[PDB]
Amino acid sequence: VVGGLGGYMLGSAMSRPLIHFGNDYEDRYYRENMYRYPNQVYYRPVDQYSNQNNFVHDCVNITVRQHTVTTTTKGENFTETDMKIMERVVEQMCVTQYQKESEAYYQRRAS
């Protein structure tokens, strides 16, 4: 069911990053469910031009599409809290591999 995301790179394991969900509702809501998180994340390979403030849609959107479109077919439309927490949490995991694997290319590399 690919052809247009078909080429997105993905991380090798990274899950349940656990944010400061300093809420009642938008905290417990995810906390009771939090086991079902995706194994990994998608990203485009890092090659110059470090951005997050705009290169968040072009790395989180895709990674959230690949989780919501698999649920929407099941008779769901990801209500705004489920979606908020998704783009919010898929942000800090999809940034973490940007902000931890780039310096690795410069100084580590091949792991």
UniProtKB/Swiss-Prot annotation:
Keywords: Amyloid, Cell membrane, Copper, Disulfide bond, Glycoprotein, Golgi apparatus, GPI-anchor, Lipoprotein, Membrane, Metal-binding, Prion, Repeat, Signal, Zinc
Known function: Its primary physiological function is unclear. May play a role in neuronal development and synaptic plasticity. May be required for neuronal myelin sheath maintenance. May promote myelin homeostasis through acting as an agonist for ADGRG6 receptor. May play a role in iron uptake and iron homeostasis. Soluble oligomers are toxic to cultured neuroblastoma cells and induce apoptosis (in vitro). Association with GPC1 (via its heparan sulfate chains) targets PRNP to lipid rafts. Also provides Cu(2+) or Zn(2+) for the ascorbate-mediated GPC1 deaminase degradation of its heparan sulfate side chains.
Record note on domains: The normal, monomeric form has a mainly alpha-helical structure. The disease-associated, protease-resistant form forms amyloid fibrils containing a cross-beta spine, formed by a steric zipper of superposed beta-strands. Disease mutations may favor intermolecular contacts via short beta strands, and may thereby trigger oligomerization. Contains an N-terminal region composed of octamer repeats. At low copper concentrations, the sidechains of His residues from three or four repeats contribute to the binding of a single copper ion. Alternatively, a copper ion can be bound by interaction with the sidechain and backbone amide nitrogen of a single His residue. The observed copper binding stoichiometry suggests that two repeat regions cooperate to stabilize the binding of a single copper ion. At higher copper concentrations, each octamer can bind one copper ion by interactions with the His sidechain and Gly backbone atoms.
Pathological association: PrP is found in high quantity in the brain of humans and animals infected with the degenerative neurological diseases kuru, Creutzfeldt-Jakob disease (CJD), Gerstmann-Straussler syndrome (GSS), scrapie, bovine spongiform encephalopathy (BSE), transmissible mink encephalopathy (TME), etc.
Glycosylation sites: N61, N77
Gene Ontology terms: biological process: protein homooligomerization
Residues carrying lipid (GPI-anchor amidated alanine): A110
Subcellular localization, as worded in the UniProt entry: Cell membrane; Golgi apparatus
A GO CC term attached to the entry: Golgi apparatus
Keyword Disulfide bond: yes
Full protein segment contained here: 124 to 234 of 256
Annotated family: Belongs to the prion family.
Record's keyword annotation contains Metal-binding: yes
Molecular function GO labels: copper ion binding
Disulphide bonds in the chain: C59-C94
Source organism, top-level taxon: Eukaryota
Organism whose genome encodes this protein: Felis catus
Quaternary structure note: Monomer and homodimer. Has a tendency to aggregate into amyloid fibrils containing a cross-beta spine, formed by a steric zipper of superposed beta-strands. Soluble oligomers may represent an intermediate stage on the path to fibril formation. Copper binding may promote oligomerization. Interacts with GRB2, APP, ERI3/PRNPIP and SYN1. Mislocalized cytosolically exposed PrP interacts with MGRN1; this interaction alters MGRN1 subcellular location and causes lysosomal enlargement. Interacts with APP. Interacts with KIAA1191. Interacts with ADGRG6.
Name by which UniProt lists this protein: Major prion protein
